[PDB]
Amino acid sequence: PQVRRFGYTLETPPVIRLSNIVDYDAFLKGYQQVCLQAIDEIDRTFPNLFRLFSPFFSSFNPAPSDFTGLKTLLNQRLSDIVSGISQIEAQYALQYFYDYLSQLVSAFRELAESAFDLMDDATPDTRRFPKFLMLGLVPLPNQKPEVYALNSPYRSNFSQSPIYNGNQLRVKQVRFLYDRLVRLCAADSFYLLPFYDTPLKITPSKDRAATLSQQAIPYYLNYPQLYQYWSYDTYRKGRSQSHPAYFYPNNANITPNSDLLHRLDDYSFYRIEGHIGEANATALQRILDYQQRYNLAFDVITLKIGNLQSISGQFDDLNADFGRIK
Amino acid sequence: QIMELQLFHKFAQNNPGMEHLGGVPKGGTFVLVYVDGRELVRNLLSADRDPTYQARTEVIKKYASLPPGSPQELATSRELLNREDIVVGDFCLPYRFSSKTPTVSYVLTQPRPI
Amino acid sequence: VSAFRELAESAFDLMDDATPDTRRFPKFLMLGLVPLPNQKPEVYALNSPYRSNFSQSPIYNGNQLRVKQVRFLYDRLVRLCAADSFYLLPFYDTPLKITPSKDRAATLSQQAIPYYLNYPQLYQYWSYDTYRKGRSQSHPAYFYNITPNSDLLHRLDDYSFYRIEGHIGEANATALQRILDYQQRYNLAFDVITLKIGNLQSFQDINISGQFDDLNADFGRIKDTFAKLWQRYEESWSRNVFLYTLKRVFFDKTSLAEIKSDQLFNPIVARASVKEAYAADTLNYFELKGLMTAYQQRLAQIMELQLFHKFAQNNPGMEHLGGVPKGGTFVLVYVDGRELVRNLSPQELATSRELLNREDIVVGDFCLPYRFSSPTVSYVLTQPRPI
Amino acid sequence: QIMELQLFHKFAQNNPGMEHLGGVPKGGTFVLVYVDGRELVRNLLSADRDPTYQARTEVIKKYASLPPGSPQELATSRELLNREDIVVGDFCLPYRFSSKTPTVSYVLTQPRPI
Numbered sequence: 001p002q003v004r005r006f007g008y009t010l011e012t013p014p015v016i017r018l019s020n021i022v023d024y025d026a027f028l029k030g031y032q033q034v035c036l037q038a039i040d041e042i043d044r045t046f047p048n049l050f051r052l053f054s055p056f057f058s059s060f061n062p063a064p065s066d067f068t069g070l071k072t073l074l075n076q077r078l079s080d081i082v083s084g085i086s087q088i089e090a091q092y093a094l095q096y097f098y099d100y101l102s103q104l105v106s107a108f109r110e111l112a113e114s115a116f117d118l119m120d121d122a123t124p125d126t127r128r129f130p131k132f133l134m135l136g137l138v139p140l141p142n143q144k145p146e147v148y149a150l151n152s153p154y155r156s157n158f159s160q161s162p163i164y165n166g167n168q169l170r171v172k173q174v175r176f177l178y179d180r181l182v183r184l185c186a187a188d189s190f191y192l193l194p195f196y197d198t199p200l201k202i203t204p205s206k207d208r209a210a211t212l213s214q215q216a217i218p219y220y221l222n223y224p225q226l227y228q229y230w231s232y233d234t235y236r237k238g239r240s241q242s243h244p245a246y247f248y249p250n251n252a253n254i255t256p257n258s259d260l261l262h263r264l265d266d267y268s269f270y271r272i273e274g275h276i277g278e279a280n281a282t283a284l285q286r287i288l289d290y291q292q293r294y295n296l297a298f299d300v301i302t303l304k305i306g307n308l309q310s311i312s313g314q315f316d317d318l319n320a321d322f323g324r325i326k
Numbered sequence: 327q328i329m330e331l332q333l334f335h336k337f338a339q340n341n342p343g344m345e346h347l348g349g350v351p352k353g354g355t356f357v358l359v360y361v362d363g364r365e366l367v368r369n370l371l372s373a374d375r376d377p378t379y380q381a382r383t384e385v386i387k388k389y390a391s392l393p394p395g396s397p398q399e400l401a402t403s404r405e406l407l408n409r410e411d412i413v414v415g416d417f418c419l420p421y422r423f424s425s426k427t428p429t430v431s432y433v434l435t436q437p438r439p440i
Numbered sequence: 441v442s443a444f445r446e447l448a449e450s451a452f453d454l455m456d457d458a459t460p461d462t463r464r465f466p467k468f469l470m471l472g473l474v475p476l477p478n479q480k481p482e483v484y485a486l487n488s489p490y491r492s493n494f495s496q497s498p499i500y501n502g503n504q505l506r507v508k509q510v511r512f513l514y515d516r517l518v519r520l521c522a523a524d525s526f527y528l529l530p531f532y533d534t535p536l537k538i539t540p541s542k543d544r545a546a547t548l549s550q551q552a553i554p555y556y557l558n559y560p561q562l563y564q565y566w567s568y569d570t571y572r573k574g575r576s577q578s579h580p581a582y583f584y585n586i587t588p589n590s591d592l593l594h595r596l597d598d599y600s601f602y603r604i605e606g607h608i609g610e611a612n613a614t615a616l617q618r619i620l621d622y623q624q625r626y627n628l629a630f631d632v633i634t635l636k637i638g639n640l641q642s643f644q645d646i647n648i649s650g651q652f653d654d655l656n657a658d659f660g661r662i663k664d665t666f667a668k669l670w671q672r673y674e675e676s677w678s679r680n681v682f683l684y685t686l687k688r689v690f691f692d693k694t695s696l697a698e699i700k701s702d703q704l705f706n707p708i709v710a711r712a713s714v715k716e717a718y719a720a721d722t723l724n725y726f727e728l729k730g731l732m733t734a735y736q737q738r739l740a741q742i743m744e745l746q747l748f749h750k751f752a753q754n755n756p757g758m759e760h761l762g763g764v765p766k767g768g769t770f771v772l773v774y775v776d777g778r779e780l781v782r783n784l785s786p787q788e789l790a791t792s793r794e795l796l797n798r799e800d801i802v803v804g805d806f807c808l809p810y811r812f813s814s815p816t817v818s819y820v821l822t823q824p825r826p827i
Numbered sequence: 828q829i830m831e832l833q834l835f836h837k838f839a840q841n842n843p844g845m846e847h848l849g850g851v852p853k854g855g856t857f858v859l860v861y862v863d864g865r866e867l868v869r870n871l872l873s874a875d876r877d878p879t880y881q882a883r884t885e886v887i888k889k890y891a892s893l894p895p896g897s898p899q900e901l902a903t904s905r906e907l908l909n910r911e912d913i914v915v916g917d918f919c920l921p922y923r924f925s926s927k928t929p930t931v932s933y934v935l936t937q938p939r940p941i
Contacts, residue, residue, distance in 0.1 A: 002594045002595075003594060003595050004593060004594060004595075005593060005594065005595060005596075005627075006345075006346070007627065008593065013588045014593065015625050015626065016592070016593065016625075016626050016627045017625075017627070018335075018338040018339075018342070018344065018627060019336060019338070019339050021335055021336075022336075024361055024366075024414075027414070027415075084369075084372070084373070088373050088376045088378060088379045089373060090370070090371075090373035090374060090379075091370055091373070092370055092412065092413075092414050095346060095414070095415045098346075099346065099348060102595065116573075147508075147511055148508055148511060148512055148568075148571070150504075150505070150508065150572075158499065158504075160499070164499070164500055164501075165500070165501070165502050166502075191382065192382075193382050193383050193386065194374045194379065194380055194382070194383065195374060195403075196374070196400070196403040196404050196406075197383045197392070198392070199392070199393050199394070199395035199399065199400070200395075201393050205349075207351070208347060208597040208598075209597060209598050218348070223386075223390050224386065224388075224389040224390050227390075246393075247386075247390040247391065247392065248390065248391060249389060249390050249391075250389055250390065250391055256393065256394070268351065268352050269347075269349055269350075269351055269352070270349050270350050270351075270352070271348055271349040272348075272349050272350060272356065272416070273348070275358070275413060275416070276413055276414075276415075276416075277371075277374075277412060277413060278403065278412075278413055279409065279411055279412070279413070280358070280360050280411050280413065282402070282403075283358060283413055284358065286399070287356075291843060292840075292843065295839075295843050295844060295845075296843060296844060297352055297353055297843060297844030297920070297921055297922075298350045298351075298352070298353065298354055298355060298356055298422075299354075299355040299356065299422050299423065300355070300356050300358070301332075301355055301356070301357045301358070302357075302358045302359075302360065303332075303333065303334065303335050303337055303357060303358070303359050303360075304333055304334065304335070304359075304360055304361070304362065305335045305359060305360070305361050305414070306334070306335075306361065306362065307334070309329065309330075309333055309334065311328070311329065313328060317653070317654050318653075321657035321658075322657075325657075327815045327817070328815055331815060338627070339624075342623060342624060342627045342628065342629065343627060343628060343629025343767075344627075352921055353921040353922050419629070420629060420766060420767040421629075421767045421810075421811050422922050423814045424812055424813070424814040424923075424925055424930070425814055426814075426925070426926070427812075427925060427926065427928065427929050427930060428816045428818070428929060428930075429813065429814065429815075429816045429818070429929065429930045429931075429932055430650075430652075430742060430816070430818045430819060430820060430929050430930070430931060430932075431817075431818070431819035431820070431931070431932050431933075431934050432819065432820055432822075432931045432932070432933045432934070433819055433820070433821050433822065433934060433935070433936055434612065434613050434616065434822060434933065434934075434935060434936070435613065435822070435823065435824060435935075435936050436611075436613040436614065436617070436935070436936075437611050437613060437614070437799065437824075438824075440792075613935065616933065616935065617935060620935075632933065633931065633933055634933060742929075745928070745931075754927060754928050755928075757853075757854075809853055809854035810854050810922075810923050812923070812925060812930050813930055813932050814930070
């Protein structure tokens with residue numbers, strides 16, 4: 001699966017142009033036309049996950065009917081957001097919805113690249129090739145032999161117990177990964193709160209190049225159910241209540257801003273959350289004051305969508321030349 | 327020039343490369359994007375007046391706690407009657423602005439055909 | 441060199457031993473050299489001399505895959521050092537293209553395939569795991585007026601670098617136009633500048649002019665002043681040829697931008713400066729004489745920063761990576777035609793030979809890790825001089 | 828304005844984010860931090876005068892060699908008789924605090940009808 005970029009404009013050949021966003025309606029169209037095709041890609045790709053898990057060599061074989069209802073859920077949620085199962089959703093959330101969809105694809109990848117390297121064979125069957133070995137197809141005369149491939153089509157390939165090569169650990173990771181993909185795609189995972197109930201916060205994390213397991217848990221997700229089952233290693237160590245995220249659980253001895261007071265060596269990105277829905281001057285001023293309180297580095301700009309715009313500036317040299325004529 | 331460059335979302339035509347990652351890199355710039363109009367704001371805020379939409383915070387607060395904040399900020403944020411503008415989105419852009427050393431444009435002409 | 445390093449670093453850890461030999465040390469075990477008295481035993485070393493070290497079949501610790509990776513990498517190394525791997529000889533022109541790629545810090549197998557390599561033969565055999573998965577036709581590269589790239593349409597998260605190809609050998613202005621339009625069409629983030637190699641006095645094939653806001657309020661202040669003085673000493677002044685020429689060449693133009701750099705100084709003294717060649721105070725009290733010198737000095741201080749060896753002293757760090765990092769600066773480098781073709785309708789032949797050695801040919805690239813641009817309307821204009 | 832903005836360590840109030848890593852990222856900014864005075868310098872340099880401190884150079888030179896330098900530079904650094912200020916600290920920043928040059932921003936001429 002792939003995901004399109006925002007400004008995608010249909011042409012021969014197509015382009016990415018933001019010069020077409022003249023007013024608000026163009027903004028809504030520009031995000032709707034991308035969310036639709038992303039949902040279609042999800043529908044085409046997800047229901048065939050069962051093909052990575054061999055029926056002969058894996059111990060875990062998922063049922064194919066897990067992901068047959070995504071198309072309808074996703075279209076209902078989108079038509080609910082845009083055309084302001086039915087629920088009440090705020091329209092200014094559309095930009096988040098897109099991002100949410102993107103994360104799903106990432107989780108998919110994090111699974112498919114891991115399960116590719118698994119070999120388990122927990123219970124052997126001794127009557128597969130009792131007293132003979134089949135060698136591959138005999139090539140044409142004076143042709144070079146194949147020396148890079150691992151698995152010829154008709155050759156008796158090697159299969160082992162789930163002990164060596166570290167597989168005893170992968171046999172677990174894949175389960176903990178598959179389950180997460182089932183929990184993300186649920187009816188109540190996309191779960192926003194009314195905007196006046198969420199104060200501003202900035203939380204550090206890693207860039208989009210890192211695996212989904214190493215990024216901070218986004219703000220628009222249903223935390224109390226997904227804060228477990230985010231990342232495997234943190235689960236092993238018992239630190240799952242400490243991952244960077246907007247919320248923190250009740251009844252654990254957790255400092256409110258424990259991450260921004262100690263050193264910051266392995267973070268390069270700041271997630272800024274809590275501003276959507278508020279006024280211009282208020283949000284801008286709160287962001288500037290937060291940056292002042294915790295000693296961070298970036299700039300803030302504000303822009304207006306429209307084509308109307310319903311001033312004077314301090315120019316040093318023009319005033320210097322104006323001061324000698326009056 | 328100032329009236330148009332720094333105020334319209336047709337500011338990307340001078341500074342292309344804006345993207346949504348939900349935040350800001352160390353050293354970049356963070357762009358807020360808003361709209362105007364009283365009737366439009368009143369229509370956009372309609373979902374935040376529903377009783378079934380508002381119940382969500384109490385469902386959440388059973389298990390997880392939210393960041394605290396000064397009471398005046400929260401008090402100001404709850405007055406939805408007289409509001410003219412509303413923030414819709416944000417974008418990322420990976421470089422700060424010089425802000426000094428005035429600019430002098432250098433102009434070139436294209437060669438003549440034969 | 442980088443491919444060599446990749447191969448060696450991979451092969452350092454291989455243990456295969458497909459066919460053992462039971463005659464090696466059949467009934468005993470050797471241990472290492474006995475240390476000196478009261479010395480510590482060696483506990484970090486993995487292969488000591490004379491000790492009987494452990495050797496295994498290639499099905500443990502993940503060697504069943506290294507035994508293929510090292511073959512694939514050696515074969516790639518052999519293919520790269522062949523007579524046909526660098527096939528930009530003879531040189532020829534190609535359309536402009538930009539491809540996203542990973543940094544030079546990444547393994548060579550994870551970078552893009554540069555366009556001076558014989559792609560139809562190396563697009564297989566570049567990267568191994570792509571070979572396993574069977575997506576070798578879709579690895580980012582050049583091949584397979586300008587060429588529209590496709591992967592620039594989907595999300596670009598795990599790329600950080602832009603490779604720019606197709607601009608060497610063309611005229612300066614067309615390369616600038618094409619690169620800027622290509623940036624605009626796909627919404628990319630980088631800056632563009634151009635520089636020249638040579639000495640300052642080579643700027644004789646163009647006319648130099650310019651407008652600085654800082655001086656506008658002065659040119660008016662002076663101009664009208666002179667006009668007033670015209671209406672009070674008119675009698676004697678309208679007979680002095682010098683004053684009439686100075687009135688109709690300068691002080692009679694709307695803007696200072698219409699005075700070229702050559703009209704500010706005497707050509708003969710300037711030619712004498714190179715060894716190869718071998719009641720007025722009314723205008724001085726009122727600074728009609730200082731404004732022109734300031735204008736000249738600013739024009740010279742701007743034109744002198746167009747040269748490579750003098751730009752390099754204010755912005756050190758230029759290197760060639762074949763492109764630009766996300767958010768950086770792309771520097772083109774050009775030279776006059778006279779320095780390339782040193783020695784190769786007769787009038788049309790002569791004019792063509794003359795104008796095709798005044799052209800600006802783009803020769804090289806560099807990159808910088810920062811962008812320096814931020815609403816002033818001062819500018820400098822350069823106009824090609826007719827032949 | 829530069830009498831105050833660009834001199835005091837309360838320059839962070841306009842450019843927050845300073846950090847100590849012992850160096851500078853490629854393309855960043857390197858900030859030195861010093862303190863003025865005769866008495867402060869005479870007191871702070873007290874450790875570099877005692878021979879038990881000075882012996883460290885000779886003893887460490889048994890095994891490893893130090894970078895080269897021209898004799899007159901080391902001869903001048905050794906005086907320490909009339910010194911008014913001393914460097915005390917260092918910091919980093921992730922961007923260029925540019926100066927010393929105007930920008931150019933190469934652009935092309937517009938298509939005017941002929």
